[PDB]
Amino acid sequence: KCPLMVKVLDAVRGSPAINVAVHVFRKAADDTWEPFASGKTSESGELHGLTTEEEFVEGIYKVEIDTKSYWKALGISPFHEHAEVVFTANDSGPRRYTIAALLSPYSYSTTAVVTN
Amino acid sequence: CPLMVKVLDAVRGSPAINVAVHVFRKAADDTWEPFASGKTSESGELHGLTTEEEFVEGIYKVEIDTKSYWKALGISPFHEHAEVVFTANDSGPRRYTIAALLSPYSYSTTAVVTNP
Amino acid sequence: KCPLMVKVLDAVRGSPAINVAVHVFRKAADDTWEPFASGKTSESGELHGLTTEEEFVEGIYKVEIDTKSYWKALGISPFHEHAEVVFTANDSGPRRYTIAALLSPYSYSTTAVVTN
Amino acid sequence: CPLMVKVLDAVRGSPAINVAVHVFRKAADDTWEPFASGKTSESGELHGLTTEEEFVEGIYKVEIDTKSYWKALGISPFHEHAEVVFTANDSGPRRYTIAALLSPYSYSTTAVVTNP
Numbered sequence A, C: 001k002c003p004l005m006v007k008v009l010d011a012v013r014g015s016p017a018i019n020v021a022v023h024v025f026r027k028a029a030d031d032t033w034e035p036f037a038s039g040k041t042s043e044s045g046e047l048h049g050l051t052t053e054e055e056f057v058e059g060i061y062k063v064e065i066d067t068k069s070y071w072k073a074l075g076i077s078p079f080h081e082h083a084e085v086v087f088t089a090n091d092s093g094p095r096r097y098t099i100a101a102l103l104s105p106y107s108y109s110t111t112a113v114v115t116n
Numbered sequence B, D: 001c002p003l004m005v006k007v008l009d010a011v012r013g014s015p016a017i018n019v020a021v022h023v024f025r026k027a028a029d030d031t032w033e034p035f036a037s038g039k040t041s042e043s044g045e046l047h048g049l050t051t052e053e054e055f056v057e058g059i060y061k062v063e064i065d066t067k068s069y070w071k072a073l074g075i076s077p078f079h080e081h082a083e084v085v086f087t088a089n090d091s092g093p094r095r096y097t098i099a100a101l102l103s104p105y106s107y108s109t110t111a112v113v114t115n116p
């Protein structure tokens, strides 16, 4: 909710993308990705409550949005296995990161909106 | 070829073929005058709309008839058309590619401008 | 607020696009665009209160987002005069239209999120 | 040329030149193996990464090193890189164009897939 929030929209139906699985990982010292947090988007296509200010320290993070299962459930053949968003969290910046993703079967866009 | 239009379909991951495109130029009386038109090819591209001589400085609108496109595929889309409005050649002649990426409830448009 | 809301984001700064002028028009019987509603986006990049359920009847509407002035204020040279979103409002659909726009100097995307 | 990568800069309205691109293929042990790499040309395109013979069915990741790109232009961007993960050739060989459109806090990626 507070420091990291994910929002997913469906460009085909013009709707929130509901029940999309989302996994967050943090990069470890041996360069592997450690599970950090996960959830499914709500009816408003949002996922809040992933982490806390205390836990969300500087580091490299990856957000993986399971887009292929979403399109499969709709009966629409998709290109990507999942959308991945990789970034370094930085304390000098604003306190709240919203990772937004706009999905189509053969294309996606992602935007970070970083606010105080 | 100072003006080229390229249209892609984000649902099918393909060129958007046979899409109507109308170009207008703003007249002295602030009205939109017809300038040129055509339909995208099998590669989703429309070349030959104008010439360097004809393509003078001015404000231009490129209307891409996306609703007709989606309707012919059985889809009822949100937008009537994608409109792209810009001032051209104000620093001297340039080569413009107007790209549009289409989904039923979303589109994006990008200009790629090169100095000949 | 209720039936029509506009949201604008800045892809360069990863922020809401604040103080962007937005004009809405409705198409008249003589095929001209009549001013309908307008405003400036807030600090959260949103514009609410444009119209009411009573006033927002079926018809063709155009939302014009004054992107060029926004980029000029930032000292960044932009391509488009403005982003235009043209659509037919339809009572058979959901009750609430959010027109979202993601802005970069040479590209923009727009998405309609239509909800109940 | 079964795999081509095209990268555009949405701030400058130009090809994104000299951008590093790394392709990986998922191995039998579920790890990512290096497959091919290169840098975009003056046209923002990268051709010649692979051959029809080499490009067998599998899961592929295309990593586009967008952070290095923006840094060299004086911009500190949000993402580390744009990642594009997909299953290839599962219905037989195809020709794939992976396009990426870049802004400092946003990117979009689109696949255009043609049957030879």
Ligand SMILES: O=C(O)CCON=C1c2ccccc2-c2ccccc21
Binding pocket: A007, A009, A098, A100, A101, A102, A111, A113, A114, A115, C007, C009, C016, C044, C098, C100, C102, C113
């Ligand atoms: O943090 C903030 O101020 C808001 C975070 O973003 N909200 C977004 C939002 C809300 C409603 C409908 C569409 C969108 C959207 C589309 C593309 C990109 C971002 C956003």
Ligand SMILES: O=C(O)CCON=C1c2ccccc2-c2ccccc21
Binding pocket: A107, B006, B008, B097, B099, B101, B108, B110, B112, D006, D008, D097, D099, D100, D101, D108, D109, D110, D112
């Ligand atoms: O937004 C996105 O994901 C991509 C938007 O552009 N795609 C483009 C694209 C895709 C395949 C082949 C050629 C082109 C191209 C040429 C000139 C200008 C733009 C684009």
